[PDB]
Symmetry: D2
Subunit: 311 residues, 4 copies
Amino acid sequence: AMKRKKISVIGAGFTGATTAFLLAQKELGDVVLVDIPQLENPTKGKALDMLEASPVLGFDANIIGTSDYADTADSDIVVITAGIARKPGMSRDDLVTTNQKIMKQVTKEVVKYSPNCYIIVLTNPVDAMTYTVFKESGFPKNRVIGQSGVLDTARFRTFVAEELNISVKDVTGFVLGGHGDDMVPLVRYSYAGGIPLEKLIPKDRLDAIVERTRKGGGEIVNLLGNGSAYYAPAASLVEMVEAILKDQRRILPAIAYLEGEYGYEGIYLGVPTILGGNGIEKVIELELTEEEKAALAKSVESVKNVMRMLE
Amino acid sequence: AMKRKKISVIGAGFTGATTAFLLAQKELGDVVLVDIPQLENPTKGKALDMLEASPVLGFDANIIGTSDYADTADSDIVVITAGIARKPGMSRDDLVTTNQKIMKQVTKEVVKYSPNCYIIVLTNPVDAMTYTVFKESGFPKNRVIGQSGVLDTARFRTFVAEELNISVKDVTGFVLGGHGDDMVPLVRYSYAGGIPLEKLIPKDRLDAIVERTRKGGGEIVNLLGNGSAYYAPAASLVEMVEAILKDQRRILPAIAYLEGEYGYEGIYLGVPTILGGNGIEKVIELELTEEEKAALAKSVESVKNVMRMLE
Amino acid sequence: AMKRKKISVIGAGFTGATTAFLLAQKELGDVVLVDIPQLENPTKGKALDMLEASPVLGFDANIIGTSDYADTADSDIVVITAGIARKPGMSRDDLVTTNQKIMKQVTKEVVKYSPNCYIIVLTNPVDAMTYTVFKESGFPKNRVIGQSGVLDTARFRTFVAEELNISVKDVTGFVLGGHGDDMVPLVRYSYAGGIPLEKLIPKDRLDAIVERTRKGGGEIVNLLGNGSAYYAPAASLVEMVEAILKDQRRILPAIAYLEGEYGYEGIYLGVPTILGGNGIEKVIELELTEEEKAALAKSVESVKNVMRMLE
Amino acid sequence: AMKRKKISVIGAGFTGATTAFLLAQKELGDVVLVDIPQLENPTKGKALDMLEASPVLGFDANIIGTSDYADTADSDIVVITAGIDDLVTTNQKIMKQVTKEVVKYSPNCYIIVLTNPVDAMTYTVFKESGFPKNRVIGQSGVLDTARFRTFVAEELNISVKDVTGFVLGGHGDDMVPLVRYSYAGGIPLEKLIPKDRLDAIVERTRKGGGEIVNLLGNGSAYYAPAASLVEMVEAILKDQRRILPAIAYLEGEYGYEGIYLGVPTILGGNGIEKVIELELTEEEKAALAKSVESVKNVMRMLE
Ligand SMILES: Nc1ncnc2c1ncn2[C@@H]1O[C@H](COP(=O)(O)OP(=O)(O)OC[C@H]2O[C@@H](O)[C@H](O)[C@@H]2O)[C@@H](O)[C@H]1O
Ligand SMILES: Nc1ncnc2c1ncn2[C@@H]1O[C@H](COP(=O)(O)OP(=O)(O)OC[C@H]2O[C@@H](O)[C@H](O)[C@@H]2O)[C@@H](O)[C@H]1O
Ligand SMILES: Nc1ncnc2c1ncn2[C@@H]1O[C@H](COP(=O)(O)OP(=O)(O)OC[C@H]2O[C@@H](O)[C@H](O)[C@@H]2O)[C@@H](O)[C@H]1O
Ligand SMILES: Nc1ncnc2c1ncn2[C@@H]1O[C@H](COP(=O)(O)OP(=O)(O)OC[C@H]2O[C@@H](O)[C@H](O)[C@@H]2O)[C@@H](O)[C@H]1O
Ligand SMILES: O=C([O-])CC(=O)C(=O)O
């Protein structure tokens, strides 16, 4: 018998709710939206409101809200958005201690009810939180993935598209490294209809676009005043969920476990990835200049510093 | 030159923001999201977050947030979601009069910059607020429309689909009048696969579905705590916008100005409508039973009552 | 590991190819397009032409053209469009017996390589050809299905839409039995925005729409000069395939095996069905008037009559 | 009032019909399918068939078949697929006859041309129309990049979504691909596929149209060409400002003028908003020079 895919979204706040609604609209599977017992009723309210949209938008989906992880049993994909979010002036690194505990508590319940699932993590700081989920899970590395690069290249592409007055569809970006201020946007691997951006955009304006990408999460935090971005992070999660569920073998930046690639091991890092029905099918190694190699090395040091703060 | 449709959404809260994001993903036009000066930055945050999703979801649309109505100039369609969140223990009169003042202020600036726009109104109470928008615009009646019935039919279809374990695609509801006590459903014009629902669902369970539809807004409030539905309301506005922008000539329940239809004149009422490129193309006049006529007379009496609260 | 659905389409003519292309652009699965050994190369050309559209239209799907049923192994769904048109100087008896022979040979190869698949049959006459697939497969009845009523309701809806100048989305048709004189339309369960059509269209013009639906296949045959309709038949097959692959539990008219429904057994007949992940989830039994029962009894004699033409 | 876009497709053969069905499914506007008086009824049949699918696929569009150009009045876009040395001279006369009726009923329309050889036929459509260069476009590069992307995706076992190609000039020997400006997820293909396999993919791309012809035995490709037309139509109707290869009128770009050539383009609401000029190596300028010579050769066969 033909059975729907099942996606559990852990954390039913801004990012989780926005993710859930996109997953159901795209009919990518049944959705279980999970929060803490104190936010059970709000979570069910969000889930029923989304389901009540299904006849207008013309989609078939089950959406439920729960505080009971038994409702996540046999999920194909579990998306983790559970944790504390930042306010203006905070680094993503300021959340490590609270979020690590949430990741350990969440992973333990997820692997109990869905021992065969793929896990995609948003929770900040995401390199260190995806690492925590990996180790707690006991899963092989292909099955635990972080989102950062899709969102960072998305922001990059938006600003480039505004600069050149072209469709975002024909702009390509390339971000490696941690999801931090030390991100390594590779302008050399960045194009407008395949044309190197360095040939199209003067260095000063291109440098400003690279800096605006680095500070992109902060820009949304400062505008909102009382939370962080959710539309583009949710979109970024859905693209990664869709690559796996439909076995698309996309080349996408994702937070992956390294065992030698770029000359690093035992860390999660933002790298180029093949993403398919088996999760991360492989980490792609670019040939880097010594300047890019150095920029990446600073990124890895930030990651390891954050990992030293884990219990 | 071919130019995009332009949609302004007035009020950048949960419903306005959710509507803007759906409109952009469907590439129905460029979106201008408007709120009060005090929320200029949050509104610009939401709009820029949505645009940053565009390279990932693969849509071409411009989204800006603003507090300057000059940014709304030459909108084809304006959606009004502006209104105050009812104060704990505020009188219905003070609500009507506070929201009436907002519709008057909003409508003045909208018609100044967009003299040819179609306006769709969500603001509660939608009958009296659409009436307020109509009289202040001095637009013809075909161009000033309220949302109500589409949201009630959506909830009705969800509940019927749950009862019968079938797709929402193959359920239809039929509602005249507004929300709650003011709703006039025709179960006799309500079907699963074109089969009367009275032949498929026992009377006690069908009456319970009709009641649950009446109370359906309050059901989401009670689950959320401090808030009201936005996913299904947003979907409802988008279906009505889409019907006009693509000249689809849908049959949809809408809040329309009457001039003799059903016996009534000088009022806005939830009635079946052909909705297309000239907005309300006509009000459809059913033959109603004596019971139905008297349920509608009582609904119209509730509508006259709210109109007497206006200044 | 997540794996794409696999759909084999048997017969790479107008309907089969049109069907394969729609299935691919919807990313419903990988498509295997099968024809006779003599048409191997044109079938590969069609498949590769479709595949070369994938980067432009933006779908991830494999499409291959073959004469080797080994390529159909582990198909979730098989769509049988294989068949021969009535050649000038051929009896109807010979036409039926030729198509029966094709159904026997195709089914034997299909079930050898896909013992767990659902089968959807287009080949006319669909009632007798579906029965042949059913008897040959050894499959339970829920897994062997014919297309007929979806295509008839589609033409009916198109004609009503034109008559009323409204969206086809808001029109519904209801038909039991087959095409032509075998069609049993229930205009009383056919609506525009849930309004019975008998109230909106005078009887003469409405009877003319019913008769044009009966003749609908013939109208396209007579307009083309060579061959029969393929766009609407392909779309009808795609709606039924999607209902099963996505477990939609649609209510759709289907050619279903009866074991007592409507007072008939051991035949395939056009009936309302719930269509989902287990295939036909049930046949829906309506209360019919004496007029409707008499009309459906003539349709049943026509089915039994073609079954008597089978070897 | 809000009113649908109107698209006329001239030639209701395999490519015209396939284009029309895609345009209506995507709700890009009303479709008018046009052919010769002798095929009026088959044309109405295909159009009615496509319309009868609309309730099932859930799209709202009008689709009509005709041999009367009066029905194409006020078309926002007109796609020309009508056609069949002597090849040039016959198809040229089809273009002049078509353009004359098209500009008569739709003087303000954008025109996209498929008819082979599309360089000369787009030139003929341009001169006859008297339209500015921005309103008369040929399809070629999108089709060639689609085949290339398909071959590369197969070679690397990855999504066609993350493969890009870059072709100047026309089909076959006339095709000037820039493998250096072709990538998988932004990675240069020269670092992913060895030269022998990449050369074979470039050669398959050149022969790609011939490969479908040989496999079919009784016509040429229609699915990928129709998709190539729809993407260019969509860039214009929805003012997307896509960068796409297109057959465009040159007034100095790449050092050439008074010809149509396959060049990178910004495609939006005003049709071709600009011809993009990039720095070519000396090998690529030489190849483009050879390609342009071949376009001048076919342009001399025109009456
Ligand atoms: N142990 C837990 N189990 C389940 N849900 C939890 C748990 N702890 C917290 N949550 C829930 O996680 C949700 C987080 O949502 P928001 O506070 O709205 O934050 P959001 O914007 O979604 O960001 C979530 C996360 O992703 C990053 O972008 C951000 O920095 C943060 O780490 C809240 O609803 C909260 O109750
Ligand atoms: N004069 C005004 N101009 C513009 N925006 C305004 C104005 N007055 C209020 N607003 C804005 O309207 C928005 C209303 O959003 P929410 O309070 O979040 O309510 P929402 O869920 O969006 O529902 C919109 C409206 O529809 C009805 O359900 C109800 O009447 C509600 O106010 C707020 O962001 C508020 O700042
Ligand atoms: N044994 C077989 N196995 C596989 N394919 C076969 C076989 N016998 C014939 N076919 C193929 O079936 C295809 C039928 O295509 P068309 O003749 O173009 O007919 P189409 O418009 O697709 O209609 C398909 C069929 O369904 C009904 O409408 C009608 O009964 C018609 O035969 C042809 O390509 C034919 O070679
Ligand atoms: N003057 C004309 N006006 C309109 N239509 C015409 C005219 N002359 C011919 N046609 C029609 O053009 C159609 C061409 O369709 P096909 O022969 O099937 O060719 P197709 O596969 O659609 O390719 C169309 C064209 O594009 C190029 O690939 C190549 O030049 C080919 O001729 C036919 O229906 C033919 O009757
Ligand atoms: O910055 C944040 O806090 C959330 C996030 O990860 C992002 O938006 O980049």
